[PDB]
Amino acid sequence: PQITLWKRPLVTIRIGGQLKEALLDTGADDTVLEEMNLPGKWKPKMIGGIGGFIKVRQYDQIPVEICGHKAIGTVLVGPTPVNIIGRNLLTQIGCTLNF
Amino acid sequence: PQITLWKRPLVTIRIGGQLKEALLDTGADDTVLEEMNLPGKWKPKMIGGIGGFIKVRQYDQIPVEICGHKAIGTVLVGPTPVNIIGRNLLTQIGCTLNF
Numbered sequence: 001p002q003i004t005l006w007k008r009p010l011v012t013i014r015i016g017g018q019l020k021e022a023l024l025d026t027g028a029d030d031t032v033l034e035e036m037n038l039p040g041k042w043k044p045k046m047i048g049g050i051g052g053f054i055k056v057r058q059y060d061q062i063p064v065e066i067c068g069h070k071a072i073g074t075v076l077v078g079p080t081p082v083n084i085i086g087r088n089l090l091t092q093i094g095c096t097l098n099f
Numbered sequence: 100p101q102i103t104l105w106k107r108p109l110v111t112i113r114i115g116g117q118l119k120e121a122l123l124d125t126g127a128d129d130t131v132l133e134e135m136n137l138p139g140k141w142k143p144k145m146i147g148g149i150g151g152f153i154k155v156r157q158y159d160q161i162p163v164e165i166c167g168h169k170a171i172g173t174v175l176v177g178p179t180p181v182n183i184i185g186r187n188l189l190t191q192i193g194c195t196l197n198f
């Protein structure tokens with residue numbers, strides 16, 4: 001992976017057998033994804049972003065594929081503009097910032 | 100830099116004669132700074148994201164120094180809890196995502 005920023009950093013992910021588009025977003029601590037149905041038990045959570053508070057469903061230990069790299073972790077699902085991959089998963093697959 | 104993501108990617112920036120800390124953010128299109136007074140003319144704007152929309156003022160042709168590097172361009176000022184360096188400035192300093 002070398003990704004330059006004249007365009008948004010948008011990738012494909014695979015989750016639950018599904019194919020979605022997501023954004024690699026170094027200023028997000030966490031990963032937040034649009035409304036979907038995922039297996040298992042979930043915890044409610046409120047998260048604050050710059051324009052206010054949103055409400056979320058926490059799922060733990062979920063397998064995702066990002067660009068051919070496999071990861072296992074927490075995913076929050078809720079009312080976000082785009083799909084967001086945050087630092088929790090970016091670190092799993094080996095991502096860094098460079099200059 | 101090489102910059103890893105175990106924590107938040109905070110750098111030092113200088114604007115005016117001011118010393119600030121700010122986030123390197125590949126998820127941001129634009130550069131969003133905290134409340135300050137700047138030389139020049141500006142226009143208002145509505146920008147949105149997690150939680151909703153804020154109101155902002157657009158300045159053009161601002162010089163900023165970020166980690167030792169010169170950039171020049173557009174900053175948006177308004178009530179953010181955090182200073183974010185977006186892709187408009189990030190490209191000027193040679194910044195890349197790797198993988």
Ligand SMILES: CC(C)(C)OC(=O)N[C@@H](Cc1ccccc1)[C@@H](O)C[N@@+](C)(Cc1ccccc1)NC(=O)c1ccccc1
Pocket residue numbers: 025026027028029030031032047048049050051081082084086124126127128131146147148149151152153181
């Ligand atoms: C999702 C969460 C809460 C984990 O992180 C963010 O929302 N991160 C912000 C930056 C930030 C950092 C620390 C505390 C609070 C906020 C951004 O990385 C999110 N981002 C880029 C999302 C986005 C992406 C594409 C288009 C729209 C929104 N920016 C914003 O949500 C945002 C909102 C209002 C104004 C400026 C930026």
